[PDB]
Amino acid sequence: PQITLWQRPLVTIKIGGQLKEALLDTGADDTVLEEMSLPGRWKPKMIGGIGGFIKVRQYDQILIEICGHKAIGTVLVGPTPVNIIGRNLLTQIGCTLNF
Amino acid sequence: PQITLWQRPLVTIKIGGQLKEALLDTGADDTVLEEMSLPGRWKPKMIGGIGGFIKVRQYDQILIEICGHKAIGTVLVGPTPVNIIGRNLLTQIGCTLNF
Ligand SMILES: CC(C)[C@H](NC(=O)[C@H](OCc1ccccc1)[C@H](O)[C@@H](O)[C@@H](OCc1ccccc1)C(=O)N[C@H](C(=O)NCc1ccccn1)C(C)C)C(=O)NCc1ccccn1
């Protein structure tokens, strides 16, 4: 679909059989989700944002459905204010910026 | 144009007679630029994201040129490590997310 930006570009995503709201963020290299349980082993990663850096848990090859489009990739879990869908998954669903 | 997200969507902007590189950021409510001098009176503001909050200076009615398109809006100036063009200005140039 086509999403304007007068409001936050929030979409519904499905992960671990649960529905959550997440922000489509072209300014994020990675996808960062709020604290939750995911399968498998995780690796450590440090990511930087506007306020500085935070420590997150990296899970690989995670299945996530964004607005009905299935994607399988890396997801970071940590103290983020909101769920963020980054470029790593936006490219998987063919998302582009237009103007 | 149509911008893909394989790489960070960086563009050239013009503000106060200066050419700067900025990130088209759909995950940003506001536009935040690295420390610089702007005309007029400003108001202090606290903005947050990944990592926490930072104190910035808020300037209103600022003219910015983005890839040729002129836009007017509020611009925040502060210790951000990267220049960010947020939704307040992305809307003015007719920017949308598509997939
Ligand atoms: C791991 C990624 C998260 C990271 N990218 C960013 O931090 C982007 O910023 C560019 C950026 C990149 C590096 C350093 C600083 C800035 C984001 O899009 C950012 O803009 C946005 O974050 C998502 C978000 C949305 C809503 C609430 C909280 C958080 C955010 O902080 N939005 C704020 C916002 O809208 N806040 C609203 C709010 C809601 C609730 C509570 C408080 N505030 C704005 C005021 C900035 C990244 O790619 N680092 C690699 C990287 C890239 C380049 C250089 C170095 N590393």
Residues composing chain A = 99
Task: Number of A to B CB contacts under 8 A, please give it.
Answer: 131
Q: Which atom of ligand 1 is nearest to the CA of B27?
A: 18
Q: Which technique was used to obtain these atomic coordinates?
A: X-ray
Q: Residue B54: list chain A partners with CB under 8 A.
A: 50-51
| Structure tokens that stand for A4 in this block | 């304007």
| Residues linked to residue B10 through DSSP beta bridges, in sequence order | B23
Beta strands in B10-83 (DSSP E): 10-15, 18-24, 32-34, 43-49, 52-66, 69-78
Q: Could you tell me the domains of chain A?
A: 1-99 (2.40.70.10)
Rounded Cα distance between A17 and B77, Å, is 41
What's the distance, CA A46 to chain centroid?
16
Quoted resolution (Å): 1.8
Rounded Cα distance between B96 and A97, Å, is 6
Residue A96 CB partners (closer than 8 Å, separation 6+)? B2, B3, B4, B5, B97, B98, B99
Cβ–Cβ contact B24 with A under 8 A: yes
3-state secondary structure B62-83: EEEEECCEEEEEEEEEECCCCC
* B4, A91 Cβ separation under 8 angstroms: yes
- Angstrom CA distances, A85 to A51, A97, B16, stand at 19, 15, 33
